[PDB]
Write a protein that binds this ligand. Structure first.
Ligand code: NA
Length: 330
């Protein structure tokens, strides 16, 4: 089997991407944030505290003929941005892009933090990191990908995120029309439960490539590119008037600037992030200070290849017995 679903930016900045997901019978379609940095599929629901719901579409298990309470199971998750959610668990039929899993754990939120409530466009998350990170207790649950894997034509999914445009998540196949040149594969460590890999270095603009190992994660659920302070300082030093602002919470730059590209290494291959991808616009409405898309990972404890980096590539998440990542230009 295969599945193919379009993923759409939630706003004009590509802050996140939403993908429609069918849950239950008859189908209830929710728009979920596919997150390769977490392992819970959780939804706004008929159980969510009413004051914490503001415009989201909810899953109502009582209206699904295939929903069953997973008795005694609870979940609670905290993300890198400080957001959180928790609740109880149902099993139900879940379909993505025509690919169906029966018996998927659908984590029903009873509580969500303010950042979720305030984002009316995101009806929940679909985690695509390794199932070792799933938070359901006392019986850990599998991701949608892990439950689909054995049925797929190939044990893979691909992320093809757009810049200010829709893109695609495919399950079970490589679309050889979706990228240019060849795919370069690189080793993955699953020790922390993430798609963790080592970049071979970077370049700023037209500068020379610096060969240096940068361990990080491929995380579709993180907006920005978070790299070591040395690398980030080297990038922003090429932008006149850029500075790190403790008041704003990272590097800002004059909105009048033209940003340089950023290149990262994948083995001997190179992925180029255009300068435009690194502009996250005014820090507040009407400001002439703009927020940077490359930020320091110091204090986060891991480097994160978030959407800024991933949307410059066609990315293969290879869930074979030995997992690997692949990157191609596009
Ligand atoms: Na922000």
């Amino acid at each position: 089997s295969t599945g193919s679903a379009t993923t759409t930016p939630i706003d004009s900045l590509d802050d996140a991407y939403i993908t429609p997901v069918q849950i239950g019978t008859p189908a209830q379609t929710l728009n979920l944030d596919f997150d390769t940095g977490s392992s819970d599929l959780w939804v706004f629901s008929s159980e969510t505290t009413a004051s914490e719901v503001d415009g989201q579409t909810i899953y109502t298990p009582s209206k699904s003929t295939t929903a069953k309470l997973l008795s005694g199971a609870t979940w609670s998750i905290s993300y890198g941005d400080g957001s959180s959610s928790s609740g109880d668990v149902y099993t139900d039929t879940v379909s993505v892009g025509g690919l169906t899993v029966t018996g998927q754990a659908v984590e029903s939120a009873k509580k969500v933090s303010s950042s979720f409530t305030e984002d009316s466009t995101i009806d929940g998350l679909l985690g695509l990191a390794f199932s070792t990170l799933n938070t359901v207790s006392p019986t850990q649950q599998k991701t949608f990908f892990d439950n689909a894997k054995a049925s797929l034509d190939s044990p893979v999914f691909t992320a093809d995120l757009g810049y200010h445009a829709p893109g695609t998540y495919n399950f079970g196949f490589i679309d050889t029309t979706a990228y240019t040149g060849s795919i370069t594969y690189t080793a993955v460590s699953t020790k922390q439960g993430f798609w963790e890999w080592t970049s071979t270095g970077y370049a700023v603009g037209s500068g020379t490539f610096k060969s240096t190992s940068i361990d990080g994660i491929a995380d579709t659920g993180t907006t920005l590119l978070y790299l070591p302070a040395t690398v980030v300082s080297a990038y922003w030093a090429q932008v006149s008037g850029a500075k790190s602002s403790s008041s704003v919470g990272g590097y800002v730059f004059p909105c009048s600037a033209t940003l340089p590209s950023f290149t990262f290494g994948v083995g001997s291959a190179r992925i180029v992030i255009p300068g435009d991808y690194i502009d996250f616009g005014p820090i507040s409405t009407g400001s002439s200070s703009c927020f940077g898309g490359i930020q320091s990972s110091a204090g986060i404890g891991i480097n994160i290849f978030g959407d800024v980096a991933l949307k410059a590539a066609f990315v293969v998440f290879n869930g074979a017995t030995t997992p690997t990542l692949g990157f191609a230009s596009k």
